Amino acid sequence: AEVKGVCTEAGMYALRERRVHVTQEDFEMAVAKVMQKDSEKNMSIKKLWK
Amino acid sequence: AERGYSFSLTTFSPSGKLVQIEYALAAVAGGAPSVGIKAANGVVLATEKKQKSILYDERSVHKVEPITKHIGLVYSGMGPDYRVLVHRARKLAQQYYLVYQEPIPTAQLVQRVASVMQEYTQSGGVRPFGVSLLICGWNEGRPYLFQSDPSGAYFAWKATAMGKNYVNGKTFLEKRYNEDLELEDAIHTAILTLKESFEGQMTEDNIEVGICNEAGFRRLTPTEVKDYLAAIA
Amino acid sequence: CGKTMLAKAVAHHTTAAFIRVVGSEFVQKYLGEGPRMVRDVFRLAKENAPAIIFIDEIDAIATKRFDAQTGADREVQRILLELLNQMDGFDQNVNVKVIMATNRADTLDPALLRPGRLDRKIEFPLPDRRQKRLIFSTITSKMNLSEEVDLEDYVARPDKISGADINSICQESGMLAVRENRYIVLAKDFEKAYKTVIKKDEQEHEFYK
Amino acid sequence: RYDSRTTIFSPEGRLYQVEYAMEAIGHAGTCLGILANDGVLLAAERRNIHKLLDEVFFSEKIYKLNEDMACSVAGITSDANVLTNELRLIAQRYLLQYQEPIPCEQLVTALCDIKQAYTQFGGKRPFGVSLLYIGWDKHYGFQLYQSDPSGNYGGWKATCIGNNSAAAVSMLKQDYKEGEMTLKSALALAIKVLNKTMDVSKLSAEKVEIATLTRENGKTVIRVLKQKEVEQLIKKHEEEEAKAEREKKEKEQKEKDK
Amino acid sequence: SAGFDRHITIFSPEGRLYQVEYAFKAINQGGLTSVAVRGKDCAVIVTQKKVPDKLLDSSTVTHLFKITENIGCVMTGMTADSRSQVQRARYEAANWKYKYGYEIPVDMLCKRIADISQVYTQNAEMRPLGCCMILIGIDEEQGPQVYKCDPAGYYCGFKATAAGVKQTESTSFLEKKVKKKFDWTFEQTVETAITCLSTVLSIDFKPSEIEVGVVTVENPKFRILTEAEIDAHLVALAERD
Amino acid sequence: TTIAGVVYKDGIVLGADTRATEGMVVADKNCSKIHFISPNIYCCGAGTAADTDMTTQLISSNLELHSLSTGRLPRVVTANRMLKQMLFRYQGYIGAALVLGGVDVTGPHLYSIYPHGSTDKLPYVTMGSGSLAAMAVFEDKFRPDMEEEEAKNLVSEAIAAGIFNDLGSGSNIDLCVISKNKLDFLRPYTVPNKKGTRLGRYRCEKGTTAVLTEKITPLEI
Amino acid sequence: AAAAVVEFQRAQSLLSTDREASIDILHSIVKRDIQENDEEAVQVKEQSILELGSLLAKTGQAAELGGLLKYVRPFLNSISKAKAARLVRSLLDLFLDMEAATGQEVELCLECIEWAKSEKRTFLRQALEARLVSLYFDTKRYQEALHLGSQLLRELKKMDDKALLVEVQLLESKTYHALSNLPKARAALTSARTTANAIYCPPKLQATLDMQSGIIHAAEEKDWKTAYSYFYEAFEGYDSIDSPKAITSLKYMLLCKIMLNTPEDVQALVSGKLALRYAGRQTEALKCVAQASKNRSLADFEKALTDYRAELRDDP
Ligand SMILES: Nc1ncnc2c1ncn2[C@@H]1O[C@H](COP(=O)(O)OP(=O)(O)O)[C@@H](O)[C@H]1O
Ligand SMILES: [Mg+2]
């Protein structure tokens, strides 16, 4: 599913700039936008365990 | 979810999680904004002192208090718990001073306050202290900034923020923070990180700032804090 | 911060259909009624060619993987599972779209959040200074205002209000102006509404902070 | 439901809260340990090195219980501090009474009896901690044990506790020389297992901590490897794996030629 | 989120102590009401007085106590808990004078009772006593002192405080009054207090069904104003307004 | 061991000698018999050195906790009360006679706390071995409401009398001038007895007594 | 260095009254050599050259720049230029910012870039290249501006000074829009804004990003409400900073209020608390043009356009 979404988001990025070409950097941005790994910022809840 | 195992504090969960301490940390985060910055030659602590009215004499209960003339302490969470921890921190510092004729190193004071919190988070009829402490100190020649959490856990910080919007505070500090940030600029950074969290006008009287440098921890007076706020604005 | 309104706005500039539901409407009582309603909703979406299906509050049903040890958490998880099936399954949708608003966006199931055939992600944060100025402009152009009623000094002031808050400020200011019987609002009206719906989040117990 | 109290026996004879703690240890960091004829070593996974934290404590997971022993902790931080303090107290109590650095087995047995009392008495949850002890004692030389929450301790030539500890121990089984491993080979194997077990495929000094115990000049030495040595080991291993990959590519080229 | 409600030491998942909040609810349950205001050289406390039976003795029924010669208190809450707290404050004041050899500053007395209440909220014993205690005294350096010691652990100092059922309206009125020339005289402060109570109550005060106490920088003793003083202030000041 | 203390126009002036004899042997030449209970309270200890030092430290700790709690400087009534009550709870075995002095919001104060826990507020107090001579000098040359320099000269001449007329008195005369403005700690203000001016050099050259064994250890840097 | 500071203050007084004496005194201070251990003298003389550049700005005396870029470089490798390159930044900026044409123009900037290349100080080489790109845009050699910008950003995606990354990206966006490739200018702007939402944006850079966003939205999307929003953020930032180019932002604000077919608000803005210090023919011109648009009178419209030349004839 992530792979499909990565390709799709690269395609939508291409759709953005009146362009019909997808480039490596566009795929990179697609990866970043798809694989959003939200992480808890509560350092205390995170350090509870040594 | 793990529902049953949340009314006690002497019972683990299938995940292994003690729910009650996490709830306490939620109480902590649901508190006042406070920020801490470890400058190259000092530490700076600040905390919103907003009151619910002009009626409260906003000079009667402080929030950045000393524990010695090299160590100080600010908080986010509840206030009575804070007073208890400050009292016990002073008592531990003085006990250490008697036993060893040397002002308590900040690391050890933090460790012992953490041990106190551990004492209170380990019995069936003791409520974990809901408050998280930032401990500033000057030992040897290196400023120290520690955070003590209700869970009995103590950990160092280059700079942090805690309270209602700790995420925003910490991202702002991440943007604005560099190691060689001398104290006069660390004060501005702390006050700005309080601004980005402080509703209403940051008057000189509704903000408390305490600075810990070689000369010794000192809580800035209203005149000094007003000067700094005017300079920043 | 305005997501129901952008949903309604796409409905305005839409050409197919806008079928709105609230997650409670699936959380209804009686086993299988929630799945029944989700299946009916998506079936209506499909029978309409390009239609759009909006779910207003999904945190009620869209939950994590809790091992339901009762008869009710199991049914809530059943609602979510039926939703997953309908959104993606052996019956791939034909030109149908789906929109969700959650208000938490952290405890949603990894399935429904599958960054693939189930959902994209968008952010709707607290109106910054820019957005807030646009809020004032759009709400207030329609009203009638004086010449000493500058809104630009009701934005520079730090304040964690949102779009709903600013709409409420303007509506309360107009209401107060009419109560004091003028047909032009004034800076005093905006001050009073500002303080009426900025400090409303008070009367809390102070030992918590 | 047979898990609301530590001191409650289940109808199938399992101390649930004890198992609860034992599985909870998995969520902690990752410690592994290797015994070698020349020395002993532990490796630890710094889960959290967020760049606004600091490195005040040279070791956040490995501690020096006395001149002849060290211990790595994994579990709840508060219980970790409590247990390390009790361990130091036991060691120095033994020194006072007997005047010989405590045999590692005796120290472990003492602390694990403390944990047993906790799992058997009144209203006290079992210590949510697992520890790996390394040390030297005049009776059986170098020695490495693992102590769980249930107070049970096992003497392991190599072992691992924490996240993906099962994988770590599987690879230890695969690549451990049962009687011939030296300290440098032990370090290499530890780096390999850490690389394969840590979530990030790339290692660095910002996520690992290595501790080495060796007898030199008749006295023990417990050294926490500095980031320079840590990075040199990480490198050497990564470039060794890269050379293996180049050899594999050469084999593929030979197969294509065939 | 109502399951985290039957013990004073169990947090709610949102970090709230419900049986600490219920102590404040008990304050409101006290039925009566109280207000206090501090001026340039005076401090004045005004308080309800209900005598719903001809046999009740107004000599005994009173919620203005003398903790020590210089420090006085007004109670708002259950009477039994209030009197226990008053006894505790008297004890602590006496012990302070005995050990450290000088009269306890109001700062410390309010702090001390706040800490007793905090101990009770943390260690799951007692049942956090439901009274709100407002202390008045004379401090040599700062001047007059008015402090409030809620039954959760705040000992905050106030320019003008209110406690009880009409706390919100009283606080609003006191803010409005304070925003104009906070430097108030003895009679003006006595007024401000009595007028605040009267307006928040929508009543006019008889000279008896109100208890008023005062301390001053010239009279550092907790003077409980008598019927004569209450009547004089009410009538004369309302007239001359 | 001789200590003395006087109250002057603005504050207090305390003065102690520097000697502590373990028998008839002068163990110390520069002991520190004036101790710091708070920024405006200093205590001159006589009697058993260990107990005076530990008692002063414990009282200073309690008073510093009290100061950090109050925000206002501690006032000498509290120091006197704590000292006396502790020294009475211990029925007298704490051989510490303490001339306590300080300056607080209520002007100066100079208490004398005898070992058993008996206190006597007074303008001038001497208690110790040489209190004999110290109080003789005070009585003979005291006038109420002196100024700084004259009070210092008085409490230095008293201690000098102690030095020169009491075995076990000090070699240096240390002073402490405490007021709302200054906290001078003269350490040492005067040196009545300097040294014997050792005669011709008589060392033993490098190499005078050989050894039996050596275990020179190569400790790292 | 109290005596040196007094000499510097009297040089400042001579700047105020008899500038040539100040120039000579600062030149002598520069000629003075410095020790090899301490740094007070080098601090004094770097401040002296700063105020000498101030004198050059005041009197249009750019004839010294040859010396200030030829004979000061040698010693400069003594105060760890890795952090003192801000001095060279300020010197070059003020140089190219005097009112009169520099004559050398890009020649001296290229000389500075070559000197940095020889020094092997990439940290300052990047700043020099970015300032050269800005110079190319100002002189309108958009093609070479764009070329250098592309090279520099390709380099800066892998190195330090992300603030300079944002600067170079916005320079490229401005050049793109000048070349009239609006989609690519928008792409550059979006990249600049994404990179700016990960670092600290000084008021100057934040307001510049806002102004460029306003220009791009005004040109392309026809969302003049958002264009005005960004223009106003830029105006507020420049007003806070006390920057010369706040009048331009206010002009764009009035222009948005006109093109929205709501010319009644131009007068409200012009007679507005903030927008008084900026009053003048600049704002009165928009006033008149909006009056013409209000009355739908093309005669007055063209009258205003011809009468307010250099206020609405030049800003593209
Ligand atoms: N950008 C905006 N412009 C105008 N009104 C807004 C805006 N954002 C929010 N509002 C106000 O908020 C209300 C809708 O809020 P809504 O989108 O329902 O928030 P939520 O659905 O998250 O509770 C409307 O009444 C509207 O007036
Ligand atoms: Mg809605």
mmCIF file of N, CA, C and O in Angstrom, chain C residues 10-70:
data_model
loop_
_atom_site.group_PDB
_atom_site.id
_atom_site.type_symbol
_atom_site.label_atom_id
_atom_site.label_comp_id
_atom_site.label_asym_id
_atom_site.label_seq_id
_atom_site.Cartn_x
_atom_site.Cartn_y
_atom_site.Cartn_z
ATOM 1 N N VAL C 10 -16.632 22.076 -1.108
ATOM 2 C CA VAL C 10 -16.508 21.148 -2.223
ATOM 3 C C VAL C 10 -17.889 20.682 -2.639
ATOM 4 O O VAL C 10 -18.162 20.512 -3.832
ATOM 5 N N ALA C 11 -18.791 20.492 -1.678
ATOM 6 C CA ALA C 11 -20.166 20.178 -2.041
ATOM 7 C C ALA C 11 -20.762 21.285 -2.903
ATOM 8 O O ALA C 11 -21.500 21.015 -3.857
ATOM 9 N N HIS C 12 -20.445 22.536 -2.581
ATOM 10 C CA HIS C 12 -20.918 23.661 -3.380
ATOM 11 C C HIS C 12 -20.403 23.574 -4.807
ATOM 12 O O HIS C 12 -21.181 23.609 -5.766
ATOM 13 N N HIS C 13 -19.092 23.458 -4.969
ATOM 14 C CA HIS C 13 -18.492 23.303 -6.294
ATOM 15 C C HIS C 13 -18.296 21.835 -6.657
ATOM 16 O O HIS C 13 -17.232 21.429 -7.120
ATOM 17 N N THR C 14 -19.328 21.026 -6.451
ATOM 18 C CA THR C 14 -19.315 19.615 -6.802
ATOM 19 C C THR C 14 -20.358 19.344 -7.873
ATOM 20 O O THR C 14 -21.345 20.074 -7.998
ATOM 21 N N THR C 15 -20.129 18.286 -8.645
ATOM 22 C CA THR C 15 -21.011 17.933 -9.741
ATOM 23 C C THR C 15 -21.631 16.549 -9.624
ATOM 24 O O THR C 15 -22.419 16.176 -10.501
ATOM 25 N N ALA C 16 -21.314 15.772 -8.587
ATOM 26 C CA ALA C 16 -21.776 14.391 -8.516
ATOM 27 C C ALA C 16 -22.753 14.132 -7.377
ATOM 28 O O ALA C 16 -23.913 13.800 -7.623
ATOM 29 N N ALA C 17 -22.306 14.267 -6.133
ATOM 30 C CA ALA C 17 -23.178 14.195 -4.968
ATOM 31 C C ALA C 17 -22.323 14.340 -3.723
ATOM 32 O O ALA C 17 -21.148 13.967 -3.745
ATOM 33 N N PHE C 18 -22.895 14.830 -2.628
ATOM 34 C CA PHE C 18 -22.180 14.930 -1.357
ATOM 35 C C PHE C 18 -23.033 14.265 -0.284
ATOM 36 O O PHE C 18 -23.991 14.862 0.215
ATOM 37 N N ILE C 19 -22.677 13.036 0.075
ATOM 38 C CA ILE C 19 -23.430 12.238 1.028
ATOM 39 C C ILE C 19 -22.690 12.321 2.351
ATOM 40 O O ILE C 19 -21.616 11.734 2.507
ATOM 41 N N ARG C 20 -23.258 13.044 3.304
ATOM 42 C CA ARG C 20 -22.616 13.300 4.583
ATOM 43 C C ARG C 20 -23.196 12.384 5.648
ATOM 44 O O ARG C 20 -24.407 12.149 5.688
ATOM 45 N N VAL C 21 -22.323 11.863 6.509
ATOM 46 C CA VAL C 21 -22.734 11.046 7.639
ATOM 47 C C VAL C 21 -21.861 11.414 8.828
ATOM 48 O O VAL C 21 -20.774 11.978 8.680
ATOM 49 N N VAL C 22 -22.352 11.092 10.019
ATOM 50 C CA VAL C 22 -21.612 11.295 11.256
ATOM 51 C C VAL C 22 -21.360 9.934 11.886
ATOM 52 O O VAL C 22 -22.257 9.085 11.929
ATOM 53 N N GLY C 23 -20.139 9.733 12.380
ATOM 54 C CA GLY C 23 -19.751 8.421 12.867
ATOM 55 C C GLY C 23 -20.710 7.852 13.887
ATOM 56 O O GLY C 23 -20.923 6.641 13.941
ATOM 57 N N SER C 24 -21.303 8.707 14.715
ATOM 58 C CA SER C 24 -22.347 8.228 15.608
ATOM 59 C C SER C 24 -23.434 7.514 14.820
ATOM 60 O O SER C 24 -23.983 6.495 15.270
ATOM 61 N N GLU C 25 -23.743 8.023 13.628
ATOM 62 C CA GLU C 25 -24.788 7.416 12.815
ATOM 63 C C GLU C 25 -24.452 5.965 12.488
ATOM 64 O O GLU C 25 -25.356 5.171 12.208
ATOM 65 N N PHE C 26 -23.165 5.602 12.513
ATOM 66 C CA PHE C 26 -22.781 4.196 12.433
ATOM 67 C C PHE C 26 -22.710 3.555 13.809
ATOM 68 O O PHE C 26 -22.884 2.338 13.933
ATOM 69 N N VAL C 27 -22.460 4.352 14.844
ATOM 70 C CA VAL C 27 -22.335 3.839 16.206
ATOM 71 C C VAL C 27 -23.720 3.547 16.771
ATOM 72 O O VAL C 27 -23.860 3.169 17.938
ATOM 73 N N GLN C 28 -24.751 3.689 15.945
ATOM 74 C CA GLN C 28 -26.114 3.428 16.393
ATOM 75 C C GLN C 28 -26.209 2.077 17.102
ATOM 76 O O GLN C 28 -25.300 1.252 16.997
ATOM 77 N N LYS C 29 -27.294 1.860 17.847
ATOM 78 C CA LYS C 29 -27.460 0.684 18.695
ATOM 79 C C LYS C 29 -28.235 -0.412 17.977
ATOM 80 O O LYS C 29 -29.291 -0.150 17.396
ATOM 81 N N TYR C 30 -27.707 -1.637 18.068
ATOM 82 C CA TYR C 30 -28.222 -2.892 17.520
ATOM 83 C C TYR C 30 -27.119 -3.501 16.665
ATOM 84 O O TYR C 30 -26.611 -2.845 15.748
ATOM 85 N N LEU C 31 -26.735 -4.744 16.953
ATOM 86 C CA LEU C 31 -25.562 -5.320 16.309
ATOM 87 C C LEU C 31 -25.747 -5.350 14.802
ATOM 88 O O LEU C 31 -26.811 -5.720 14.297
ATOM 89 N N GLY C 32 -24.707 -4.946 14.088
ATOM 90 C CA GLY C 32 -24.723 -4.985 12.651
ATOM 91 C C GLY C 32 -25.412 -3.817 11.997
ATOM 92 O O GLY C 32 -25.365 -3.705 10.766
ATOM 93 N N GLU C 33 -26.024 -2.923 12.770
ATOM 94 C CA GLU C 33 -26.690 -1.792 12.146
ATOM 95 C C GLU C 33 -25.680 -0.774 11.640
ATOM 96 O O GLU C 33 -25.907 -0.139 10.604
ATOM 97 N N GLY C 34 -24.555 -0.621 12.330
ATOM 98 C CA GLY C 34 -23.511 0.267 11.882
ATOM 99 C C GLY C 34 -22.905 -0.189 10.569
ATOM 100 O O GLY C 34 -22.771 0.587 9.615
ATOM 101 N N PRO C 35 -22.503 -1.460 10.503
ATOM 102 C CA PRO C 35 -22.064 -2.002 9.215
ATOM 103 C C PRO C 35 -23.134 -1.916 8.151
ATOM 104 O O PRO C 35 -22.823 -1.639 6.987
ATOM 105 N N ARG C 36 -24.395 -2.148 8.515
ATOM 106 C CA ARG C 36 -25.472 -2.036 7.542
ATOM 107 C C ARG C 36 -25.507 -0.639 6.950
ATOM 108 O O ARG C 36 -25.628 -0.465 5.733
ATOM 109 N N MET C 37 -25.386 0.374 7.805
ATOM 110 C CA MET C 37 -25.474 1.746 7.326
ATOM 111 C C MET C 37 -24.244 2.127 6.514
ATOM 112 O O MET C 37 -24.357 2.854 5.524
ATOM 113 N N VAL C 38 -23.063 1.639 6.900
ATOM 114 C CA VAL C 38 -21.872 1.938 6.108
ATOM 115 C C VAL C 38 -21.985 1.310 4.728
ATOM 116 O O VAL C 38 -21.640 1.932 3.712
ATOM 117 N N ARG C 39 -22.456 0.066 4.666
ATOM 118 C CA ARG C 39 -22.613 -0.591 3.377
ATOM 119 C C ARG C 39 -23.664 0.110 2.534
ATOM 120 O O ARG C 39 -23.474 0.291 1.328
ATOM 121 N N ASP C 40 -24.770 0.531 3.147
ATOM 122 C CA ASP C 40 -25.767 1.286 2.401
ATOM 123 C C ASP C 40 -25.186 2.594 1.879
ATOM 124 O O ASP C 40 -25.451 2.988 0.737
ATOM 125 N N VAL C 41 -24.383 3.277 2.696
ATOM 126 C CA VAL C 41 -23.814 4.558 2.289
ATOM 127 C C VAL C 41 -22.892 4.373 1.092
ATOM 128 O O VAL C 41 -22.987 5.099 0.095
ATOM 129 N N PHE C 42 -21.982 3.403 1.171
ATOM 130 C CA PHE C 42 -21.050 3.202 0.066
ATOM 131 C C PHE C 42 -21.760 2.672 -1.169
ATOM 132 O O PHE C 42 -21.360 2.982 -2.295
ATOM 133 N N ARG C 43 -22.806 1.877 -0.984
ATOM 134 C CA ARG C 43 -23.588 1.413 -2.117
ATOM 135 C C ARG C 43 -24.282 2.574 -2.809
ATOM 136 O O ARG C 43 -24.367 2.605 -4.040
ATOM 137 N N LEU C 44 -24.802 3.527 -2.037
ATOM 138 C CA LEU C 44 -25.360 4.733 -2.638
ATOM 139 C C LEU C 44 -24.282 5.516 -3.375
ATOM 140 O O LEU C 44 -24.500 6.009 -4.493
ATOM 141 N N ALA C 45 -23.106 5.639 -2.762
ATOM 142 C CA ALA C 45 -21.982 6.284 -3.427
ATOM 143 C C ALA C 45 -21.741 5.660 -4.792
ATOM 144 O O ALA C 45 -21.614 6.362 -5.799
ATOM 145 N N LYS C 46 -21.671 4.330 -4.837
ATOM 146 C CA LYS C 46 -21.373 3.639 -6.086
ATOM 147 C C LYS C 46 -22.502 3.808 -7.093
ATOM 148 O O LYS C 46 -22.264 4.177 -8.247
ATOM 149 N N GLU C 47 -23.743 3.544 -6.676
ATOM 150 C CA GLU C 47 -24.855 3.656 -7.609
ATOM 151 C C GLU C 47 -24.898 5.042 -8.229
ATOM 152 O O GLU C 47 -25.281 5.188 -9.395
ATOM 153 N N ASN C 48 -24.505 6.067 -7.478
ATOM 154 C CA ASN C 48 -24.201 7.349 -8.091
ATOM 155 C C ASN C 48 -22.812 7.275 -8.704
ATOM 156 O O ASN C 48 -21.896 6.690 -8.123
ATOM 157 N N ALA C 49 -22.653 7.846 -9.887
ATOM 158 C CA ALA C 49 -21.412 7.588 -10.601
ATOM 159 C C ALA C 49 -20.235 8.249 -9.892
ATOM 160 O O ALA C 49 -19.372 7.538 -9.362
ATOM 161 N N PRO C 50 -20.146 9.578 -9.845
ATOM 162 C CA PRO C 50 -18.949 10.226 -9.282
ATOM 163 C C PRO C 50 -19.060 10.670 -7.827
ATOM 164 O O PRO C 50 -18.191 11.421 -7.374
ATOM 165 N N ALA C 51 -20.080 10.233 -7.099
ATOM 166 C CA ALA C 51 -20.419 10.789 -5.792
ATOM 167 C C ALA C 51 -19.281 10.817 -4.779
ATOM 168 O O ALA C 51 -18.237 10.171 -4.951
ATOM 169 N N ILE C 52 -19.506 11.572 -3.707
ATOM 170 C CA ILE C 52 -18.548 11.803 -2.637
ATOM 171 C C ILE C 52 -19.224 11.422 -1.328
ATOM 172 O O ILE C 52 -20.394 11.758 -1.117
ATOM 173 N N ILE C 53 -18.502 10.724 -0.455
ATOM 174 C CA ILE C 53 -19.010 10.318 0.849
ATOM 175 C C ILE C 53 -18.136 10.959 1.913
ATOM 176 O O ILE C 53 -16.921 10.755 1.920
ATOM 177 N N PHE C 54 -18.751 11.705 2.823
ATOM 178 C CA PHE C 54 -18.046 12.398 3.893
ATOM 179 C C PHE C 54 -18.453 11.824 5.240
ATOM 180 O O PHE C 54 -19.635 11.565 5.479
ATOM 181 N N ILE C 55 -17.472 11.616 6.112
ATOM 182 C CA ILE C 55 -17.711 11.138 7.469
ATOM 183 C C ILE C 55 -17.145 12.175 8.426
ATOM 184 O O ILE C 55 -15.934 12.449 8.421
ATOM 185 N N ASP C 56 -18.020 12.733 9.265
ATOM 186 C CA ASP C 56 -17.686 13.950 9.991
ATOM 187 C C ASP C 56 -16.822 13.670 11.211
ATOM 188 O O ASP C 56 -15.842 14.381 11.452
ATOM 189 N N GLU C 57 -17.175 12.666 12.004
ATOM 190 C CA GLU C 57 -16.440 12.362 13.226
ATOM 191 C C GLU C 57 -16.195 10.863 13.267
ATOM 192 O O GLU C 57 -17.103 10.089 13.584
ATOM 193 N N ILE C 58 -14.965 10.464 12.951
ATOM 194 C CA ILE C 58 -14.612 9.057 12.811
ATOM 195 C C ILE C 58 -13.904 8.505 14.037
ATOM 196 O O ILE C 58 -13.751 7.276 14.138
ATOM 197 N N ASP C 59 -13.476 9.353 14.977
ATOM 198 C CA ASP C 59 -12.809 8.838 16.166
ATOM 199 C C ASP C 59 -13.704 7.911 16.965
ATOM 200 O O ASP C 59 -13.196 7.108 17.753
ATOM 201 N N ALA C 60 -15.021 8.008 16.791
ATOM 202 C CA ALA C 60 -15.931 7.143 17.532
ATOM 203 C C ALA C 60 -15.750 5.683 17.142
ATOM 204 O O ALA C 60 -15.750 4.800 18.007
ATOM 205 N N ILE C 61 -15.593 5.408 15.850
ATOM 206 C CA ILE C 61 -15.485 4.049 15.346
ATOM 207 C C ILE C 61 -14.060 3.711 14.927
ATOM 208 O O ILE C 61 -13.554 2.640 15.268
ATOM 209 N N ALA C 62 -13.388 4.609 14.205
ATOM 210 C CA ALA C 62 -12.030 4.351 13.731
ATOM 211 C C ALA C 62 -11.085 4.361 14.920
ATOM 212 O O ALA C 62 -10.644 5.418 15.373
ATOM 213 N N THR C 63 -10.759 3.170 15.422
ATOM 214 C CA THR C 63 -9.958 3.017 16.630
ATOM 215 C C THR C 63 -8.754 2.124 16.361
ATOM 216 O O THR C 63 -8.544 1.691 15.227
ATOM 217 N N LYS C 64 -7.967 1.832 17.388
ATOM 218 C CA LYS C 64 -6.779 1.007 17.235
ATOM 219 C C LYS C 64 -7.183 -0.467 17.271
ATOM 220 O O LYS C 64 -8.359 -0.814 17.158
ATOM 221 N N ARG C 65 -6.203 -1.358 17.411
ATOM 222 C CA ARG C 65 -6.459 -2.795 17.490
ATOM 223 C C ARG C 65 -6.565 -3.198 18.960
ATOM 224 O O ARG C 65 -5.644 -3.757 19.558
ATOM 225 N N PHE C 66 -7.720 -2.903 19.549
ATOM 226 C CA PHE C 66 -8.029 -3.338 20.904
ATOM 227 C C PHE C 66 -8.708 -4.698 20.852
ATOM 228 O O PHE C 66 -9.715 -4.869 20.157
ATOM 229 N N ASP C 67 -8.167 -5.657 21.591
ATOM 230 C CA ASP C 67 -8.741 -6.997 21.630
ATOM 231 C C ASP C 67 -10.057 -6.926 22.384
ATOM 232 O O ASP C 67 -10.089 -6.975 23.615
ATOM 233 N N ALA C 68 -11.155 -6.815 21.646
ATOM 234 C CA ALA C 68 -12.458 -6.644 22.268
ATOM 235 C C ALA C 68 -12.810 -7.857 23.111
ATOM 236 O O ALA C 68 -13.127 -8.925 22.579
ATOM 237 N N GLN C 69 -12.753 -7.698 24.427
ATOM 238 C CA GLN C 69 -13.099 -8.748 25.369
ATOM 239 C C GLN C 69 -14.536 -8.645 25.846
ATOM 240 O O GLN C 69 -14.917 -9.348 26.785
ATOM 241 N N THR C 70 -15.332 -7.780 25.238
ATOM 242 C CA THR C 70 -16.745 -7.648 25.545
ATOM 243 C C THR C 70 -17.543 -7.829 24.258
ATOM 244 O O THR C 70 -17.009 -8.239 23.226
#
